[PDB]
Amino acid sequence: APSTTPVNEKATDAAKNLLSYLVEQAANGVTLSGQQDLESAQWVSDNVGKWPAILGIDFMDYSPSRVEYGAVGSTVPDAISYDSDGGIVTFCWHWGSPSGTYNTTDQPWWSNFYTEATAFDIAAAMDDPDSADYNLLVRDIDAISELLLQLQDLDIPILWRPLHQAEGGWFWWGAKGPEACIALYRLMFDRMTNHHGLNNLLWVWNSVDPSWYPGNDVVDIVSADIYADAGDHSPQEETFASLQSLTGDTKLVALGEVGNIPDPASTGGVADWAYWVTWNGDFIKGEDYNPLEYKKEVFSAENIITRDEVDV
Ligand SMILES: OC[C@H]1O[C@H](OC[C@H]2O[C@@H](O[C@H]3[C@H](O)[C@H](O)[C@@H](O)O[C@@H]3CO[C@H]3O[C@H](CO)[C@H](O)[C@H](O)[C@H]3O)[C@@H](O)[C@@H](O)[C@@H]2O[C@@H]2O[C@H](CO)[C@@H](O)[C@H](O)[C@@H]2O)[C@H](O)[C@@H](O)[C@H]1O
Ligand SMILES: *[C@@H]1O[C@H](CO)[C@@H](O)[C@H](O)[C@H]1NC(C)=O
Ligand SMILES: [Cl-]
């Protein structure tokens, strides 16, 4: 069954308490609501009637290579505000490649997390710790670690989901097979936990295939991102079962991203997702994926937690 002990023995009380709360809720057939982007969370409050429990945001535009092209990151204040309002925060990282950005017509700099938008080679970087690219990877990790340390100084625990969707291959970190991506994940875990003393993090992995798994010693929560056909609100039992066997059923299981919110009237005892995070834009705002009447039902449900109900 899911562990309530963070893999970082030095975890803060706020990180320990968040993991224990999520495990308890999921064991009871309760799922936390979530939404990517503060403006979309505001839309849900304004149109559906509830603030999502979890705010998903991204370190993307703090990536050092993106700063070189004029990017201005602004999500750390949104984490602080959501936490001040009683919510929970998850970060992903659409990591702009440390070198190799093309910045062409078809591959603008602002797409430089996609494999197609950069020359960057994660495998060549990880095989040579003396290389410029290896040193730039560690510098990028240090850049994002500073942001996480600001959040740790404020006693804000974070559901940290780096190197997401890795196995798909469409982001540069997944373009050179599993070994290089696992090595980068474990390097990040060590650099953040040990060198930086980051103790406010719960580590969320986001690939299903066992050959991509970085190990139970460096992961607190396993997840997948599901973009089913518009209007498919099934519980996604097969994916849930694959995420249980990934860890020998020792880690909490969640949805990192959804296009379609799984119907909470059909998940109980089939696929006890700890949380889901709806993507931004049309996925939450339109009528094709998650219609207004359905959203109102989901967010009002007894077995869905919204921000007003969070009680860590
Ligand atoms: O490539 C065409 C694209 O145009 C518009 O999006 C542009 C926007 O795309 C960002 O990547 C998205 C991606 O489009 C898709 O929604 C999904 O894969 O997510 C990624 C990453 O999302 C991240 O950014 C958004 C806000 O854009 C949000 O905060 C989310 O939380 C975060 O995870 C990304 O490439 C952006 O850079 C890009 O916008 C550009 O942004 C830069 C500054 O970052 C500006 O300088 C630039 O002018 C432009 O706005 C459509 O929205 C999309 O549908 C697709 O058509
Ligand atoms: C990226 O490409 C655009 C479009 O050609 C160009 O105007 C811009 O100066 C480039 N950015 C950098 C920092 O070279
Ligand atoms: Cl503490």
Author numbering: 1 to 312
Quote the study's own text:
Endomannanases catalyse cleavage of the β-(1 → 4)-linkages in mannans to produce mannooligosaccharides which may be further processed by e.g. the exo-acting β-mannosidases and α-galactosidases. Endomannanases from families 5, 26, and 113 belong to clan GH-A and share the (β/α)8-TIM barrel fold and catalytic machinery, and catalyse the cleavage of the O-glycosidic bonds in the mannan backbone with net retention of the anomeric configuration.
The YpenMan26A chain can be traced from Ala1 to Val312 without breaks, and forms a (β/α)8-barrel fold as expected. Since YpenMan26A E165Q was not completely inactive, it is likely that the residual activity has caused hydrolysis of the MGGMM between the backbone monomers in the −1 and +1 subsites, after which MGG migrated to span the subsite −4 to −2, indicating high ligand affinity in these subsites. The electron density of MGG is clear and unambiguous, except for the galactopyranosyl unit in the −3 subsite, which points out of the binding cleft. There is electron density present near the mutated Q165, which is remote from the ligand, and was described as acetate, which fits the density well. Interestingly, because of the captured ligand in the present study, it is possible to identify interactions between the galactopyranose unit and the YpenMan26A in the −2 subsite not previously described.
